[PDB]
Amino acid sequence: KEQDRWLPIANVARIMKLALPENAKIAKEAKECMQECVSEFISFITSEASEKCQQEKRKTVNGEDILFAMTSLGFENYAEALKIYLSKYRE
Amino acid sequence: ESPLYVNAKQFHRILKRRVARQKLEEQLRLTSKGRKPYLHESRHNHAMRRPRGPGGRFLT
Amino acid sequence: GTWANVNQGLQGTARDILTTYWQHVINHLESDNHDYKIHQLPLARIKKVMKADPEVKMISAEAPILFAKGCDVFITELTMRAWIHAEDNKRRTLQRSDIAAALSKSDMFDFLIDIVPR
DNA sequence: AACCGAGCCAATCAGAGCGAAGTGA
DNA sequence: TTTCACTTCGCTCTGATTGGCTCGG
């Protein structure tokens, strides 16, 4: 479970690598920090979506709940960009 | 340095997440467990035994 | 408005680059032929992080799909924001302090106050 | 001078993906 | 009773995990 509370570090560190110049290096420190930030990002947004689902007496968190939670929590750019992505997944 | 007022849209969820992480810290001790040198004994022993080049790299 | 978070707290060249990156993300998410089996992050591990919350019961396949994409954009824009501080200090190595410095520029990152203490 | 630590390499096997079966509202 | 929408099962197969050395900082 201790490895399960984060996304795999190699996957996170690869995305960081592609974000930086070819000559750039990343401290193990920074990879672990990013790993912790990403996991909080998921849990923070999920918690907001989860509480609204419990209030409306719905057992299932869906894509639309994640987008609504993103807007509520001040990730408006994320929600708006992913809105088209969800509708194309559903068709 | 901790501010009194943070992002108004996030503050209440931040408090609830602090409560949620405290409860996971009580039951699993995960917030303070720390990181193991390696996750898996099998993958460790693998890496240790593997044929290596003179530069300490895994061989071609 | 909706896109304030893209440029929030950034100056000069950094503003143009992050805006161009977000226009690149928007163009990609608006594209018509996605393969929903191709992601940088595993869906099962995203779903496990969500299920760490005992308040969460059942999760639609939609949610980890949105997060896979969302988390990529998050990691990318924060790493690009953090790199600014490495360049400021004439370093080729990204350090934890570079991420901490980046978080302080936008209130969008306030939810990480406990993950990366100030 | 001495020290610190991230990239480099690729094979195993933990586990991610997936179809089938199980669950319940 | 069947249907719907998820979980859990069973299994196949793949890509994340992994450390000794170098040499710039």
Numbering used by the authors:
A (entry chain B): 42 to 132
B (entry chain A): 231 to 290
C (entry chain C): 47 to 164
Show passages lifted from the paper:
In addition to our previously determined An_CBC–cycA crystal structure, we also obtained data on the An_CBC in complex with the cccA DNA fragment (2.2 Å resolution). Superpositions of the Afu_CBC–cycA and the Afu_CBC–cccA complexes as well as the corresponding A. nidulans proteins indicated high structural similarity, suggesting that complex arrangement and DNA bending are uniform among these species and independent of the nucleic acid sequence and the target gene promoter site (root-mean-square deviation [rmsd] 0.153 Å for A. fumigatus, 0.246 Å for A. nidulans, 0.306 Å for cycA, and 0.369 Å for cccA complexes; Fig S2A). We, therefore, focused on the A. nidulans CBC.
The core version of the CBC is a heterotrimer of the subunits HapB, HapC, and HapE that binds the CCAAT box, a promoter element present in about 30% of all eukaryotic genes. The two histone-like subunits HapC and HapE associate with the DNA backbone and bend it in a nucleosome-like manner, whereas HapB with its sensor helix αS and its C-terminal anchor inserts into the minor groove and recognizes the CCAAT box. Depending on the target gene and other transcriptional regulators, the CBC hereby either activates or inhibits gene expression. Recently, a pan-azole–resistant clinical Aspergillus fumigatus isolate was identified to carry the mutation P88L in subunit HapE of the CCAAT-binding complex (CBC), a conserved eukaryotic transcription factor.
